[PDB]
Amino acid sequence: TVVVTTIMESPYVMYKKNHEMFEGNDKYEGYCVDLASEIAKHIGIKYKIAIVPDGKYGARDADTKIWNGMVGELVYGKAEIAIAPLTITLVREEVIDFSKPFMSLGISIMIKKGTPIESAEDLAKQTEIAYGTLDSGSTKEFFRRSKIAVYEKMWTYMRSAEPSVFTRTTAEGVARVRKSKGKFAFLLESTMNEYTEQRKPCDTMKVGGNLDSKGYGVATPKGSSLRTPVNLAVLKLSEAGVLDKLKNKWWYDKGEC
Amino acid sequence: TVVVTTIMESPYVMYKKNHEMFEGNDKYEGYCVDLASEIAKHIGIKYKIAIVPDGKYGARDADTKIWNGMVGELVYGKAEIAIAPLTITLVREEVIDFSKPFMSLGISIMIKKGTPIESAEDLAKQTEIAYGTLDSGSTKEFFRRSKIAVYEKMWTYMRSAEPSVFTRTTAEGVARVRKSKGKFAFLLESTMNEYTEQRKPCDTMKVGGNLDSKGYGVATPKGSSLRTPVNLAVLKLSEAGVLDKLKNKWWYDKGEC
Ligand SMILES: C=C(C)[C@H]1CN[C@H](C(=O)O)[C@H]1CC(=O)O
Numbered sequence A, B: 001t002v003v004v005t006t007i008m009e010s011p012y013v014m015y016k017k018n019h020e021m022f023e024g025n026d027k028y029e030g031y032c033v034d035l036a037s038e039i040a041k042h043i044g045i046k047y048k049i050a051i052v053p054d055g056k057y058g059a060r061d062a063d064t065k066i067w068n069g070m071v072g073e074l075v076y077g078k079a080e081i082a083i084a085p086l087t088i089t090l091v092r093e094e095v096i097d098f099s100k101p102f103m104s105l106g107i108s109i110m111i112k113k114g115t116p117i118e119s120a121e122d123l124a125k126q127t128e129i130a131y132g133t134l135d136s137g138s139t140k141e142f143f144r145r146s147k148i149a150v151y152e153k154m155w156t157y158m159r160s161a162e163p164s165v166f167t168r169t170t171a172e173g174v175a176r177v178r179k180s181k182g183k184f185a186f187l188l189e190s191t192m193n194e195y196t197e198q199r200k201p202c203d204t205m206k207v208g209g210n211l212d213s214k215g216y217g218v219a220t221p222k223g224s225s226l227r228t229p230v231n232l233a234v235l236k237l238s239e240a241g242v243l244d245k246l247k248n249k250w251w252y253d254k255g256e257c
């Protein structure tokens, strides 16, 4: 009855092993799949998981004026709820509603083990080690808009960098870090960073602190009567220990390093 | 024109040195005083700071059925906004609205340096070192309501403990930790814990991780037309670096240890 928009991202939503022999929601597993299930039980709804057609999170296009991604699905009435690692930002909360955060994070640095970098300050003062960001998302927008001297210097480098320091997906950025032999550093959300650190061949690490402090939230379109039940469900789950339990399950219980 | 309810708590709201010769809002300084000022500038309001008469944060009384503290001020229309270290909890969000978190925190352990305790598990398995909580607030409510084995064992000890392990104020709990010579441990929010660690005689420390993950938020009563401007102001300030700058100012720039 209720359409849940989400996206393929490890370990939030992914295909089960042998997903061919499963139907509907049963094809998928992950943190956000479990989260949708808990939320639906508390607010008492039936739901259909739909993967966002364009594979995007949500940005407003400069010329067409149109929102893409999951935000777009909500804005144009194609979906009722988005349950994904969708970062709570000002631009988005202007057109959709977020619940309280179900997970906390910050922008962080991924290096290949042995790269002599300990902070964002280290990266900015040199050119030998290239560094980049996804070309779509809140991390790029953070650097684009920063007045802080260090991040301003980082944005000037990145927008000019040749060849392009921007990657299309998380896997692509992680791939580039691994194959570059200490010569590429990846700026990404600490949640994905921590997850990759736990995955073989265990050649990556998070360095320094987070550059910022934010959260992912469950999104609903403006005026949805599911806004309050959803927000309260999240607080219920958080206080019950369920969010912590879910994090440990998909991040640390499966850890290989 | 707009009434801002808040409370005396270091370093969020406090009296300036020689506050006698100042009038109105100018009597006060602190993190939340600066925060009110930033918010009011963005949403374009004039405001009067009022200290909550009963010195409480906000709980519903078992018999009278009446909310006390800052939550009460909002609920009964005595104030329009609460700007304070007011923890976002399910019970409160049921009767008031919170903005997105302006600060992240978690329940934590304060010990006197040299107390051989490294985790919550350590405290629960022994009786020689007493441990307590404020007798009013979200920390007590967390232990009261936990199904997690370890915290359940901690609550059973605390509610039965003789003499009372509960303190009326933060200063009183910190006082008890300092004067007990390693025999009392204090369960409090990590923000207050971190702040005390930076204050002379530098005899306290935070040990282990946070037991949970939550935030403080700006509160408005249900149906307030200041709800959205406030929420968006917080995201604006957060993304601009102002919340981080404010934290460093009142926690670390002043640090003595
Ligand atoms: C995986 C991606 C592209 C998403 C996830 N959350 C962020 C977002 O919602 O924008 C993006 C990550 C990033 O931008 O670093």
Ligand SMILES: C=C(C)[C@H]1CN[C@H](C(=O)O)[C@H]1CC(=O)O
Pocket (backbone or CB within 6 Å): B009, B057, B085, B086, B087, B134, B136, B137, B138, B139, B140, B170, B187, B188, B189
């Ligand atoms: C200082 C106090 C009593 C407040 C502050 N925030 C929490 C609250 O809003 O309940 C309380 C702390 C705590 O309960 O540990």
